[PDB]
């Protein structure tokens, strides 16, 4: 069998360190060596791919299977020459259950005035901030997959209302849904949004001044809040900046961004009451990943169905 | 029915508000107001109290039960002249979910390096900080009580590992625990302690150099992390700055503190990966301590059992 060609770009230095043992059974060509930049990798069947170079599938034009490196597809979607097979991302049970870590935190430091707490502290004040309980606000999940269903039921758990919001109309007990028609209702009954949609044509640009503007007002909290985990391309950051000067949205966690390293003279850094994640919100240790696209080859070479596909059509 | 006694020395504008219509049957008499003070109020049945007048049992000599002011009673006990009559404590579902949003919040601030991140946010600094997931630290919880046993579910449901000790033997499904005489053992295994005792003369100074050295060192997240919210004299806080400074502590979050308000020259104010909260971590509105001392006097004065009776030989 060939050996798997890997095109990651995060963590090099981890990725090198994994492949000295993964795919034991055939090896990998990592493009992270500028010498591998030039190689023939032209019977290549698997590729797994973050970031990955814009001609890759003429240097590798007969995939069978192509891995995300992440959970994420859209840096995959749109590439020339895509062919047409199926694109597995990464889904994993320590990916999910540390998104939803710091989505609960996100949301309880909103909902308890970590902000302002520290202000304090750092100005060696005590003051008692009196804050509203989870269950007098309505954290609104914007995404109901696999990200989305999870962060939804820890919420409940710590005592927030929740509602969410999805493409296709999902039944959830306990929690009101809502399906792409009926974004108005959905953003009208929320004080907290949570982003954990993927980037589509269809989400890229989508968290604007309007859609701020729809979150609910009266709520709790005083003024609603702005928070993504999803893509930073679905959201408008000069929108936010006038958003959250002008007090239409009270506050903000920000881990994705329009581009990212987020510049050094964006004013999301120090805006009030904004937290800001370097895209590290569900950072999965690295070896999972490559376990997870040895387990499907494995099935897909004995003649399983692959799990994780996405759906062309869709976009995710 | 004589007016009930009241004497909180929290929010007494709160206070003021809330007695115009509590205690409908028979009224209130507040210290706060001082043309009060030296009223003869000698034939006062209940009291209700926190933080209160030194004096007060020579003021009202002919007591029937006592009512905290919150869930803790250290301030009652010890006091001259406390008649041999029940202590009601405050226990409340609003104050009870409150706690565990705060503890939940500080794991997982510590968790996922909150301080860190909002260190490099303050400089403008995009620097990835890798996290292990929840399930790879133990949170050691101590008191295994009303809050204790909220704080422990809801831990685990965010995927900590979870220990409790307490007193006596308790028996939670999923979560080893451990007695008085255990704990050496539990502390061993303890990444995270988590504070939710009463203050006692067992508790007093018990937070010292000498078990904060009995914590688990070699744990995901390097170094064990102190968290208090029960009593702050449970504490020595000059053991807690030099086992921060030292790295015998990786980090604390306090909400209590030896002397209330914590004084401007504390050492725990810029402690590196330190929380201060000034005794917020749960604060139920005042109405929900008047509906439930109205509740318990009605019982009482039907002939049914009171409720949240400490025990004066365990002294909680
Ligand atoms: N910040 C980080 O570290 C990480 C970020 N992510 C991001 O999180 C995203 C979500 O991941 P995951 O939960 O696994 O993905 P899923 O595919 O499991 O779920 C995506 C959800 O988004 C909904 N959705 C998609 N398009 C639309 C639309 N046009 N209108 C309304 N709802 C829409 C889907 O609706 P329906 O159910 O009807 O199909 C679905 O509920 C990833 O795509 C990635 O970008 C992921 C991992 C880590
Ligand atoms: N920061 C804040 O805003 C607040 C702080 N608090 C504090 O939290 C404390 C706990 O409240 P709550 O949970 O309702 O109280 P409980 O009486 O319900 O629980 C107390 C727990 O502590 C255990 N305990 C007591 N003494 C010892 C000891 N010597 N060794 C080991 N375990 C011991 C008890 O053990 P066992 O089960 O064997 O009896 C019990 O599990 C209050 O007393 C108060 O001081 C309360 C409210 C808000």
Known sequence: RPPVLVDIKFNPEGVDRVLKTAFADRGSINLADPANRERDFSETEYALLWKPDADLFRR??????????????????????????????????????????????????????????????????????????????????????????????????????????????KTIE???????????????????????????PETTGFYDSELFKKLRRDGALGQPVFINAGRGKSQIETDIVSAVREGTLGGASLDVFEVEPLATDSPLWELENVFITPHDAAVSEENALFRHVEMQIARFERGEPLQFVIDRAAGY
Chains 1, 2 share one sequence.
């Open 60 to 169: 590798a034009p007969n995939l069978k299977v192509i891995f995300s490196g992440g959970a994420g597809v859209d840096h995959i979607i749109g590439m020339a020459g895509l062919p047409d097979i199926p694109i597995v991302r990464f889904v994993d049970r320590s990916l999910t259950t540390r998104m939803s870590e710091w989505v609960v935190m996100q949301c309880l430091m909103h909902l308890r005035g970590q902000y302002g707490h520290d202000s304090h502290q750092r100005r060696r004040e005590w003051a008692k901030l009196i804050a509203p309980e989870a269950a007098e606000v309505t954290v609104g999940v914007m995404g109901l997959g696999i990200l989305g269903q999870d962060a939804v039921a820890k919420l409940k758990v710590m005592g927030f209302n929740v509602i969410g919001w999805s493409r296709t109309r």
């Open 174 to 200: 306990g929690v009101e849904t809502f399906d792409a028609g009926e974004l108005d209702r959905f953003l009208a009954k929320t004080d907290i949004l949570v982003g954990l949609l993927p980037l589509t």
